[PDB]
């Protein structure tokens, strides 16, 4: 049972700026990481799989980077609709999968 955390808990980014999300794990998560976007009233939607390749049909603004146990997610374009809850899941084993605490995307004011 690996342990993973996502920081910061709350991020306030103004529209049109760049939003940076940092991910970390207690084990080697260089090629084992899951990124998904969830909204209230609906199930989560996958954004980045493996922290290196973007899903087909996903927006080009979302991006991911990092090596080893540390991963960094950067968004070139910030949108009001794109602001949602994002989390990182640990995939060190096949088992049990342990998702992160998650982050809340706030609007800077």
């Amino acid at each position: 049972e690996i342990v993973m955390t996502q920081s910061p808990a709350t991020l306030s980014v103004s529209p049109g700026e760049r939003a940076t999300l940092s991910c970390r794990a207690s084990q080697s998560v260089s090629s084992d990481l899951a990124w998904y976007q969830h909204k209230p009233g609906q199930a989560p939607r996958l954004l980045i799989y493996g922290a290196s390749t973007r899903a087909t049909g996903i927006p080009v603004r979302f991006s991911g980077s990092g090596s080893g146990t540390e991963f960094t997610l950067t968004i070139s374009s910030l949108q009001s609709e794109d602001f949602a809850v994002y989390y990182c899941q640990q995939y060190n084993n096949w088992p049990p999968f342990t998702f992160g605490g998650g982050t809340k995307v706030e609007i800077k004011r």
């Binding site: 989560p44 996958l46 899941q89 096949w94």
Partner: peptide, 8 residues
């Protein structure tokens, strides 16, 4: 295993 992608 543990896809966490393309949820229902």
């Amino acid at each position: 295993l543990n896809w966490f992608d393309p949820w229902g």
